[model samples]
Target: AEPNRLIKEKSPYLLQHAYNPVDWYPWGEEAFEKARKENKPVFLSIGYSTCHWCHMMAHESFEDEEVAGLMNEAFVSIKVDREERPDIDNIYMTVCQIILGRGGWPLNIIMTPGKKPFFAGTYIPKNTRFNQIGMLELVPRIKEIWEQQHEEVLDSAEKITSTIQEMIKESS
Candidate 1:
């Protein structure tokens, strides 16, 4: 398959996904605007080239055509090299920390096109297992909510985003 937007990126991690079945965008306004125009949420997958868990998810889900199909239907997916953009990584990593009480690499997030994160997780699977819901299960549900309850999702994004900003403010 042809490379997606990640083809021109210099970061090894982003370049790693250049040939992925999933249509991947480098972190930029073009992706955000595309999501806004398409009325789809932004799917951010952040990691380094060397993270094993990142590679695992890439092989398991990103490389899977089925998963890629759903992701393409439901989202404007962005791949970020955490090493290249530590600034973006730290902010969203803190969101994962605040919500999940911890954080790690392969930081996966689903958010509004406006850049407000509504969900934060790590190393998502392709299917539900060990009591954890995976991408296949989660993506449809998110799409349902996005389509049926957009206001609620938007409100939740606003709430989470403001709280994250406030938390960052208070810590300083």
Candidate 2:
């Protein structure tokens, strides 16, 4: 689950990321390369096609030019279709459960290239609403932190990756 391209993923969701303005790799080497090359965090968006909330978020956010623009500019964004790649969904969902005590579709998790999630959240809107921070504001804030708090972010990435590794190892 490192910040690597999913070169092997055949899931429709992963393929959807193929043509995005932001360079996307299926789930493998290339993704990591870009992350390392740009020294940027990886943005992982997980959703299923049939989920109403996922569809709603896509319509309200992903399909919106402004939302996509902000996302493309600020991070190396990757999308995953959970149905085809349950392996991926299971891992990230576990992280969500660990951190938030619940998980669902349309999960948005941001990770360092090292493949550790320093920041994780879910279904954010393009504009502030329901007492939540807007995507516009959140992206820029994350970018600022990525730039200004490089060490802290990296440390978080390392810790997260380590934690994920341990969790998986123990579960098996």
Candidate 3:
């Protein structure tokens, strides 16, 4: 087994020409509200300032114009620095753990505008890997779910939120 000690170094997000056409918003009610108004899921990316995989995904999927265009149409993308708000990161990461069985930085969550997470993942590529799906196909499927199977999406989010609440009750 390998011992772990991560979380440090240079801020990739601080780069001068880092942001692409993803139309990112900061973590705030305004962005969530925008998601509600736009009737789109909130694509929340939770990562620290210094993460290697985050930088990689930034270059591949995040920087691509096609990915940005698709995201802009179907999502209200929000970029978050976990170092700044561990509270938000902790809450959503609980759900990430529930979904993926483990959690890591660059924790990507797709949720309703009401702030309930329906999907959780990490470091998606512009194109699919041998077994993994990519953002190009992923976004459209999510869009279809939001547009078509919205009731089911909401049901899952609701169930997840209540499970989270149960965890809080037990912990506190």
Candidate 4:
């Protein structure tokens, strides 16, 4: 009935996070308010039920205690089910694609409490690999940046948000 409870009541991604060691909220005002109050960066992880990379990231990061531990320590983790909330996916995806020139599910975007992205990336490994920073390595780095170089992060967020805003304006 526990699985059914989530299945019947929440998105699949929320149900996925139900067993995650990281405390996760389904996308909503409560999560946003908590992020602002705690002054924690919002870890918006977007994915769908059938995404292969999403499944891989889940196994590599979410299911790993150490990775989840770091995520819990550094972020206000939240998951959005792209299938259920196409609008949120569309908005973020457009920004990601425009900024990064590509997009994919299990998209990880790190944002300040004010809802501006300071960082964004796609599926990452639990451990270091292929010249890419692992989630474990990246988490501590993000914390360090958050603590010691917040202004830099804010600058980046401003640029990203401005670009996104301009894109929207142009489209309209």
Best by lDDT: 1
TM-score of each: 0.91, 0.78, 0.82, 0.85
TM-score ranking, best first: 1, 4, 3, 2
Model 1 ranges with Cα > 4 A deviation: 161-172
Encode model 3's per-residue lDDT on 57-108: one tens digit a residue.
Answer: 8788877889989998999988777777789989988988987678887789
lDDT of 3 at 96: 88
Report the C-alpha lDDT of model 1 over 1-172, residue by residue, as the tens digit: 7899899988877888999999999999999999999989999999998899999999999999999999999999999998889999999999889767789989988899899887778998898776577788777777877898788778878887444323222332
Please name the candidate that would achieve the greatest TM-score relative to the true structure. Answer: 1
Candidate 4 weakest lDDT stretch, 10 residues: 163-172
Winner on lDDT between 1 and 3 is: 1
Evaluation by TM-score, superior candidate among 2 and 4: 4
Cα error of candidate 1 at position 84, Å: 0.6
The C-alpha lDDT values of all candidates are 0.85, 0.69, 0.74, 0.76
Deviation of model 3 at 13, angstroms? 3.0
Q: What is the lDDT of residue 38 in candidate 1?
A: 90
The residue pairs that clash in candidate 1, if any, are: none
Candidate 2 global CA lDDT score: 0.69
**Residue 136 in model 2: lDDT:** 67
Sort the predicted structures by lDDT, highest score first: 1, 4, 3, 2
